[PDB]
Each structure stands twice: as structure tokens, then as C-alpha cells.
Amino acid sequence: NTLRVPDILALVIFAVVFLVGVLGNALVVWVTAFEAKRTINAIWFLNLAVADFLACLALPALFTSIVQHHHWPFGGAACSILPSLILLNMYASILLLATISADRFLLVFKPAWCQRFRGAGLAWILCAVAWGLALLLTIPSALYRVVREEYFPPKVLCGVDYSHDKRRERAVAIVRLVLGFLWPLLTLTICYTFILLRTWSARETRSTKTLKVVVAVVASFFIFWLPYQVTGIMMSFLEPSSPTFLLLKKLDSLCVSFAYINCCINPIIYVVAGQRKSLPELLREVLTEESVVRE
Amino acid sequence: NTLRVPDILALVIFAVVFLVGVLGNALVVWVTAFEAKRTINAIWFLNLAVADFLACLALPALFTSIVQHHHWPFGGAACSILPSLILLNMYASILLLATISADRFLLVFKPAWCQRFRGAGLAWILCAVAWGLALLLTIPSALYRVVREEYFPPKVLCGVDHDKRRERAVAIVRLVLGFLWPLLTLTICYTFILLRTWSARETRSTKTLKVVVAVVASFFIFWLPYQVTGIMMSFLEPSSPTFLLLKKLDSLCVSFAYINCCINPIIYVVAGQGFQKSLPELLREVLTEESVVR
Numbered sequence: 001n002t003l004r005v006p007d008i009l010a011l012v013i014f015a016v017v018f019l020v021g022v023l024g025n026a027l028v029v030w031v032t033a034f035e036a037k038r039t040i041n042a043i044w045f046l047n048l049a050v051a052d053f054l055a056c057l058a059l060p061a062l063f064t065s066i067v068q069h070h071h072w073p074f075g076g077a078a079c080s081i082l083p084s085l086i087l088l089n090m091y092a093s094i095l096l097l098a099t100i101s102a103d104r105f106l107l108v109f110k111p112a113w114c115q116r117f118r119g120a121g122l123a124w125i126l127c128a129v130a131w132g133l134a135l136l137l138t139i140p141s142a143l144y145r146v147v148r149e150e151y152f153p154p155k156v157l158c159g160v161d162y163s164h165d166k167r168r169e170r171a172v173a174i175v176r177l178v179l180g181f182l183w184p185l186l187t188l189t190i191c192y193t194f195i196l197l198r199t200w201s202a203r204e205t206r207s208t209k210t211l212k213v214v215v216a217v218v219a220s221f222f223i224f225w226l227p228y229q230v231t232g233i234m235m236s237f238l239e240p241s242s243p244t245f246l247l248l249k250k251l252d253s254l255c256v257s258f259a260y261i262n263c264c265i266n267p268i269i270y271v272v273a274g275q276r277k278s279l280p281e282l283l284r285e286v287l288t289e290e291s292v293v294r295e
Numbered sequence: 296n297t298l299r300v301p302d303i304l305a306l307v308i309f310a311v312v313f314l315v316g317v318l319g320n321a322l323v324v325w326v327t328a329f330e331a332k333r334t335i336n337a338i339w340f341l342n343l344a345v346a347d348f349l350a351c352l353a354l355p356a357l358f359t360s361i362v363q364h365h366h367w368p369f370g371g372a373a374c375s376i377l378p379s380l381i382l383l384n385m386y387a388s389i390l391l392l393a394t395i396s397a398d399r400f401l402l403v404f405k406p407a408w409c410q411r412f413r414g415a416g417l418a419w420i421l422c423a424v425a426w427g428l429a430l431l432l433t434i435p436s437a438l439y440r441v442v443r444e445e446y447f448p449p450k451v452l453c454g455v456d457h458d459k460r461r462e463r464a465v466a467i468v469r470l471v472l473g474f475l476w477p478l479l480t481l482t483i484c485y486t487f488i489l490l491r492t493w494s495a496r497e498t499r500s501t502k503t504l505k506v507v508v509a510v511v512a513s514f515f516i517f518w519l520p521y522q523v524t525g526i527m528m529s530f531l532e533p534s535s536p537t538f539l540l541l542k543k544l545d546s547l548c549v550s551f552a553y554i555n556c557c558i559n560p561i562i563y564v565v566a567g568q569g570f571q572k573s574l575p576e577l578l579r580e581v582l583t584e585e586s587v588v589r
């Protein structure tokens with residue numbers, strides 16, 4: 001009859017993430033757009049903002065579906081596109097964050113390279129490549145979701161359809177777990193280990209506000225993606241009949257909801273980092289630092 | 296009983312491609328491997344040759360199957376792997392050709408960037424990414440492939456695993472990712488490059504560029520009939536006579552696509568004679584050219 005507590009909590013988090021995410025990320029795009037033609041950091045934060053904004057658009061449909069006990073009245077096109085937006089957000093944000101991390105690394109260890117080659121056009125090219133690879137990785141996820149009808153009780157479910165549930169679905173879970181979480185975790189941990197050791201050690205090299213901001217965003221990625229990944233592979237290695245599988249499936253909306261916090265956490269981090277100046281001005285200072293002075 | 300004309304033609308093409316492909320690409324690997332440590336072009340051509348060599352390994356099985364009227368005696372594992380090696384060849388080849396085209400572009404338009412960043416380790420990293428992405432693209436096709444028993448007459452068939460509406464979109468995604476998008480992008484790329492090398496005397500059209508342009512053209516030339524017949528069959532009814540005709544022509548299309556796995560050495564030898572020596576010597580001059588002197 002009435003909704004379960006985890007689903008309710010997922011609805012609350014969904015609402016908050018929708019408001020803060022849509023308005024906040026839109027404000028970020030507005031602030032960074034004018035400075036995006038020259039400043040590199042502005043290009044980074046701009047792309048992260050667009051990626052977070054697109055995922056928020058799918059929220060009202062997921063909300064309506066959860067209120068209707070996972071009923072899906074939006075059709076097959078929405079079934080293929082709307083759920084996939086956050087997976088697209090996952091790959092796009094982690095790719096852009098990898099590029100930004102390479103930027104922060106090179107600024108610290110190879111200033112000479114950055115003085116000669118760190119231009120806006122290269123940044124836009126790398127961002128375009130990131131979006132391309134992200135969409136490429138998200139395509140199978142869009143193709144293989146279908147709308148199915150059930151009768152006990154009657155309901156219309158939007159879900160993944162793989163006849164080889166044991167063989168192929170586990171492969172999807174493995175690919176997502178590795179490309180989306182484990183590999184980025186390893187490489188970025190090594191990267192910021194190097195960077196932070198050098199920053200703490202040498203007085204001549206400073207910790208810029210941009211570095212602290214990027215570190216907070218990178219941490220937030222893994223923090224809010226962890227439960228969805230863990231439960232996600234766990235539901236590939238479990239029998240459907242098993243009680244553990246039942247529990248995790250009853251927690252699914254809550255995990256997706258926790259993952260969606262990535263789409264609104266960035267404006268919070270930017271504002272907190274910025275703290276006699278207006279909010280857009282604060283964002284403009286935090287998100288448009290020049291790393292290489294030229295004029 | 297007797298095979299149809301297209302199937303015999305496919306057998307002949309598979310034979311020629313197996314011989315020229317295995318021996319030629321193996322020799323190209325032998326030529327480029329010693330220099331792949333330092334010169335980047337040798338890395339490109341080495342990865343290309345490996346990709347075209349792997350596809351030929353599955354050729355004898357496909358040959359044997361076509362001789363037996365498309366009966367499949369090799370089982371499910373071979374059914375999932377061997378037919379799809381040509382697909383892995385498709386994706387790996389077009390990805391490597393994409394990075395190579397980006398290299399030919401950067402050499403012409405960004406000499407200064409090439410001076411600092413065109414290193415062997417980066418080229419090997421990009422090759423690793425191309426191979427991994429190619430495998431990742433080939434996996435879903437392999438999983439859908441399956442053995443299928445039939446009784447009138449008895450026979451074992453290897454084939455794809457529904458939803459018409461979904462199957463159409465998947466076929467369109469294959470046509471775009473494997474052909475149309477690479478066609479558009481590479482066309483624009485070499486439009487800029489060739490227009491520049493033609494306009495400016497200071498800019499030279501190097502031997503490596505001519506070779507690479509030839510290979511890139513050969514890709515679309517040989518993959519075209521297969522892509523067209525596939526996208527056509529996905530949008531046609533089985534009851535349709537033209538569908539049946541395309542179904543008969545499938546082996547010939549696979550063979551003509553398989554020419555991609557043996558035409559590369561032919562191109563290298565033709566170009567090497569064209570500039571005007573032992574075969575390995577010619578291949579070494581053509582495939583190990585250094586674009587940045589140090």
C-alpha cells in the first residue's frame with residue numbers, strides 16, 4: 001500500500017537534488033560561460049556543470065515512477081534515455097575529472113609545458129573527446145533497457161533485458177565497476193598522492209583554491225558512487241530468490257538517490273569554498289582562477 | 296549439394312586473403328617490431344599488421360564451414376570467438392586509423408606540439424586504448440552469437456541471437472560507429488590535410504601520408520558492401536525476395552570485407568615500388584619513416 005521508508009527518503013533526496021542541482025548548476029553555467037573562451041578552469045567547471053545539469057532533467061520522471069511504485073507510464077523512448085542520463089553523468093564526470101586531474105598534475109610538476117601549451121582549444125578538444133567516449137560507453141545501456149508489462153499485480157516496468165542474466169549482466173556490472181570506479185580510484189589516488197606530497201613539502205609550490213575545490217569534487221564522486229556500485233555488482237552475483245537480493249533491490253532507489261547527490265554537490269562545494277560579494281561573484285572567483293598569468 | 300556462385304567466390308577470396316594476409320602481415324610485424332621501440336610510424340603499422348593477422352587465424356574455420364554448406368562443427372566457444380575476430384579487426388583497425396590520421400594531421404598543422412609530445416610511450420598508450428576499446432566494442436556481438444540445431448536437413452548453424460524496433464536501432468548504431476562517423480570525420484581530416492599539402496610548397500606530401508591515405512580508402516572500399524547489405528537486411532522482411540538474395544550473398548560480403556586483412560602489405564609493396572631491393576627492405580623503407588628528426 002504505502003511507500004517504504006527507503007523509497008520515501010529517496011524521494012526527499014531526489015527533490016532536494018533537483019532544486020539545488022538545476023538552479024545551482026544553471027548558475028554555474030551562467031557564471032562560467034563568459035570566461036570559457038579563455039580561462040581553462042572555467043571550461044572544466046562549465047563541462048562538469050552541463051553534465052550535472054542534464055542528469056537532473058531525468059529526476060521528475062524517476063520521482064513520478066517511485067511514487068507510482070516503479071510503474072513506468074512514459075514509454076520506451078523515455079525508458080531508454082531518462083534512466084541512462086546518470087550513467088552518462090558518471091562516465092562524463094569521471095572523464096572530465098581525469099582531464100582536470102592531469103591539468104592539476106601538470107601545473108605542479110611541469111610548469112614549462114603549461115606555459116607553452118595550456119590553451120583553451122586543447123581544453124575544448126579534450127572535453128569533446130570526453131563527452132564522445134562517455135556517450136559511447138552509455139549507448140549499450142540505452143539500447144538494452146525495455147518496457148515490460150506484468151500482471152500480478154498489473155504494472156509497467158522499465159528495466160534491463162538480458163536473456164543471459166548470469167553471463168552478460170555480470171559483465172556489464174564488471175565493466176561499470178572498473179571503468180566507473182575502481183580504475184579511477186586507483187589512478188586518481190596515486191595522482192593526488194603525488195600532488196599533495198609535493199604541495200605540503202615545498203614552500204615555493206602553493207595549494208591553489210582550485211586544487212582544494214577539485215580535490216573535494218573528486219572525493220565526493222567516489223563517496224556518493226560507492227553504495228550504488230557495491231549493491232550493483234552484488235545484485236549480479238546473487239540469486240533472485242535470496243533475501244539479500246531482496247533487501248538490496250528494496251534499497252535500489254535509495255542508492256540511486258545517493259548517487260544523484262553528485263549532480264548537486266558541486267555548487268555546495270564551490271559556495272563553501274568561496275566562504276561583501278554576491279553569490280554569482282563568489283562562484284566567479286572560485287571557478288575562474290587563472291593558473292598561468294599571461295597579461 | 297553444389298555450392299552457389301557467391302559461396303565459391305567467397306572460398307577463393309578467403310584462400311587468397313589467408314595466404315597473402317598471414318605471410319604478408321607476419322612479415323610486416325617482423326619488419327616493424329625492431330623499430331617499434333623508437334619510431335612511432337612503425338608502432339602504427341605494427342598494430343595494424345597484428346590486427347589484420349589475428350583475423351586471418353579464424354579464416355580456415357570459416358572456409359571449412361562454408362565448404363560444408365554453413366554447417367558448424369567447432370562448437371559454441373569457437374562460434375562466439377572466431378566469426379567475431381573480423382569485427383574486432385573492424386573496430387581495432389578504424390580506431391588505430393583514427394589515431395594515425397590525428398597524427399598525420401598534427402604533423403602538418405602543429406609541428407611544435409609534435410616536437411615535444413610525439414613520443415613512443417604515448418603512441419603505445421594510444422594503441423593500448425584502441426585495442427581495449429575495440430575489445431569492449433566486440434564483446435556484445437560475441438555474446439549474442441550462438442549455436443543453433445536444425446533438422447530439415449540436419450545441420451548446425453552459427454548465428455546471432457526478437458524486437459524488430461530494437462534490432463533496427465542496434466543495426467543503425469553499428470553502421471554509424473563502424474562506418475559513417477569514421478567516414479565523415481576522416482573525410483574532413485584528409486580534406487584539410489591534402490588541401491594544405493597541395494597549396495603550400497613548404498609542406499611536403501610524405502610517403503607515409505600517401506600510404507596511410509591508401510589504407511584509409513581501402514577500409515571503406517571493402518567494408519562498404521557488408522555494411523550496406525547488413526543495414527538493408529535489418530530493415531527488410533525475411534519473406535521478401537531481396538532479403539533472401541542478400542542472405543545468399545553474405546559469405547561473399549564477408550570475404551570482400553576480409554580483403555582488408557591482406558591488402559595492406561599489397562599497398563606497402565606497391566607504394567615502395569612506386570617511389571622506386573628486398574621485400575623486407577622495401578617494407579622497412581616504407582613503414583619506418585621518421586617524421587621528426589632528432
Ligand SMILES: CCCCn1c(-c2ccccc2)nc(-c2ccccc2)c1CN(Cc1ccc2c(c1)OCO2)Cc1ccc2c(c1)OCO2
Pocket residue numbers: 094095098099102126127129130133178179180183184185187188420423424
Ligand atoms: C584525460 C582522461 C584519460 C582517460 N583515461 C583514464 C582515466 C584515468 C582516471 C580516471 C578516469 C579515466 N585511463 C586511461 C588509460 C587507461 C589504460 C591505458 C592508458 C590510459 C585513459 C585514456 N582513455 C582514452 C582518453 C584519452 C584522452 C582523453 C580522454 C580519454 O578523455 C579526455 O581526453 C582511455 C580510458 C578512458 C576512460 C576510462 C578508462 C580509460 O578507464 C576508466 O574510464
Ligand SMILES: CCCCn1c(-c2ccccc2)nc(-c2ccccc2)c1CN(Cc1ccc2c(c1)OCO2)Cc1ccc2c(c1)OCO2
Pocket residue numbers: 128129130131132133136389390392393394395397420421422424425428471472473476477480481
Ligand atoms: C584518436 C581516436 C579517436 C576515436 N574517436 C573517433 C573516431 C573517429 C574516426 C574513426 C574512428 C573513431 N571519434 C571520436 C569522437 C566522437 C565524438 C566526440 C568526440 C570524439 C573519438 C574519441 N573517442 C575516444 C578515443 C577512442 C580510442 C582511442 C583514443 C580516444 O585514443 C587512443 O585510441 C571516443 C570514440 C571512440 C570510437 C568511436 C567513436 C568515439 O565513434 C565511432 O567509434
Ligand SMILES: CCCCCCCC/C=C\CCCCCCCC(=O)O
Pocket residue numbers: 036037038047050120121124131
Ligand atoms: C552531450 C552534451 C555535451 C555538451 C557539452 C558542450 C557544451 C556546449 C558549449 C560550448 C561548446 C562550444 C565551445 C567551443 C569554443 C571553441 C573556441 C575556443 O574557446 O577556443
Ligand SMILES: CCCCCCCC/C=C\CCCCCCCC(=O)O
Pocket residue numbers: 182183185186189190193194197
Ligand atoms: C583498486 C585500488 C583502490 C585502492 C586505492 C589505491 C591504493 C594505493 C594508492 C596510492 C599509493 C600511491 C603511493 C605513491 C607514493 C609516491 C611517492 C612520492 O610521491 O614521493
Ligand SMILES: CCCCCCCC/C=C\CCCCCCCC(=O)O
Pocket residue numbers: 207211212213215216217219220223269
Ligand atoms: C554520509 C556521507 C556524506 C558525506 C559527505 C561528503 C561530502 C564530500 C565533500 C568534500 C569532501 C572533503 C573535502 C576535503 C577537501 C580537501 C582539500 C585539501 O586537501 O586541501
Ligand SMILES: CCCCCCCC/C=C\CCCCCCCC(=O)O
Pocket residue numbers: 209212213216268269270272273274
Ligand atoms: C546528505 C547526506 C550526506 C551529507 C552531505 C552533506 C553535503 C554538504 C556537506 C559538506 C560540504 C563540504 C564542502 C567542502 C568544501 C571545501 C572548500 C575548500 O576548498 O576549503
Ligand SMILES: CCCCCCCC/C=C\CCCCCCCC(=O)O
Pocket residue numbers: 415416419420423424425426427428431
Ligand atoms: C576505454 C577502454 C580502454 C582499455 C584500457 C586499456 C588497456 C591497456 C592497459 C595497459 C596498457 C598500457 C601499456 C602501455 C605502456 C607503455 C609501454 C612502453 O612505454 O613501452
Ligand SMILES: CCCCCCCC/C=C\CCCCCCCC(=O)O
Pocket residue numbers: 125396397400401404480481483484487
Ligand atoms: C571531428 C572532426 C575531426 C576532423 C579534424 C581533424 C582531426 C585532427 C585532430 C585534432 C586536431 C585539432 C587541431 C585543429 C586546429 C588546427 C587545424 C587548423 O587550424 O586548421
Ligand SMILES: CCCCCCCC/C=C\CCCCCCCC(=O)O
Pocket residue numbers: 482485486487489490492493
Ligand atoms: C566517390 C566516393 C564518395 C566520396 C568520398 C569522399 C572522399 C574524399 C576524401 C578526401 C578528398 C580530399 C579533398 C581534397 C583533395 C585535394 C588533393 C590535392 O589537391 O592534393
Ligand SMILES: CCCCCCCC/C=C\CCCCCCCC(=O)O
Pocket residue numbers: 478481482485508511512513515516
Ligand atoms: C582519402 C581517404 C578519405 C576517405 C575516402 C573514402 C572514400 C574514397 C575511396 C576511394 C577514393 C580515393 C580517394 C583518395 C584520393 C587520393 C588523391 C591523391 O592523393 O592523389
